[PDB]
């Protein structure tokens, strides 16, 4: 298998808003759980041994043995038999304290039709304004249906200069972050989606461009979601993976 190329093709809709994904059409989506099974964050598989997530997801415990990763899932609670559950052996937080972290799996994920890594972007690439991307996860839905199932939403990227305007996020967004969302409201990542992917289709594959991080509420008009800009951390990510 090649990164970023699912074996079940994702559908556009016919996480607040959006729709339930086709099962296994987002095969890099990970559920991050405590040792006792609480889903509290997402993540993205980026190689057989490595998961990318948000650093704030890890504030509850500094010990790798407190965490396990769920791969190949569609449901949140009643997992299918072939799902992979792997304990985490090491945790690496970005060293300038940005909201991104790496989890090393205690055993490499078995790459299957249902478990496939996403592709990383080239270093420091800036996703163009208006690019159509997807977010996925098991987070809160604010009454928009699909609770407990893997959901998706298609969202356009909003360039930082615009989303930092007073009328929107008013200077809060750093250059190592990006904005995505419908400015009229109604679609967003939400609590439980942190750490999961924002992917954009380029040519023939999906490239991981953001990590779900924070927002001013969820799905509010004029308040798009904020994502860690993965391209600004590729050099750090690769250094950790290649040295560990």
């Amino acid at each position: 298998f090649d990164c970023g190329k699912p074996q079940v093709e994702p559908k556009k809709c016919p996480v607040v808003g959006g729709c339930v994904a086709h099962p296994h059409s987002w095969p890099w989506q990970v559920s991050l759980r405590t040792r006792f099974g609480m889903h509290f964050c997402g993540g993205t598989l980026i190689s057989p041994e490595w998961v990318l997530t948000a650093a704030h997801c890890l504030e509850k415990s500094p010990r790798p043995s407190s965490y396990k990763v769920i791969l190949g899932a569609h449901q949140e609670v009643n997992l299918e038999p072939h799902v992979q559950e792997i304990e985490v052996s090491r945790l690496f937080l970005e060293p300038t304290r940005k909201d991104i972290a790496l989890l090393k799996l205690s055993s490499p994920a078995v790459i299957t039709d249902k478990v496939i890594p996403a592709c990383l972007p080239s270093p420091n690439y800036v996703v163009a304004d208006r690019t159509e991307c997807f977010i996925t996860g098991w987070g809160e839905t604010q009454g928009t249906f699909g609770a407990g199932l893997l959901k998706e939403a298609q969202l356009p990227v909003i360039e930082n200069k615009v989303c930092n305007r007073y009328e929107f996020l008013n200077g809060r967004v750093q250059s190592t972050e990006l904005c995505a969302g419908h400015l009229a409201g109604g679609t967003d990542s939400c609590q439980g989606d942190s750490g999961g992917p924002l992917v954009c289709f380029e040519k023939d594959k999906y490239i991981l461009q953001g990590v779900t991080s924070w927002g001013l509420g969820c799905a509010r008009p004029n308040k798009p979601g904020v994502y860690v800009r993965v391209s600004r951390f590729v050099t750090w990510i690769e250094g950790v993976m290649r040295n560990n």
Binding site: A54, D99, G139, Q191, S194, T212, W214, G217, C218
Partner: peptide
């Protein structure tokens, strides 16, 4: 008003 989207979230006064 900034809330990090973990479950539970981490929310801040702005």
């Amino acid at each position: 008003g900034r809330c990090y989207k973990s479950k539970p979230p981490i929310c801040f006064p702005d």
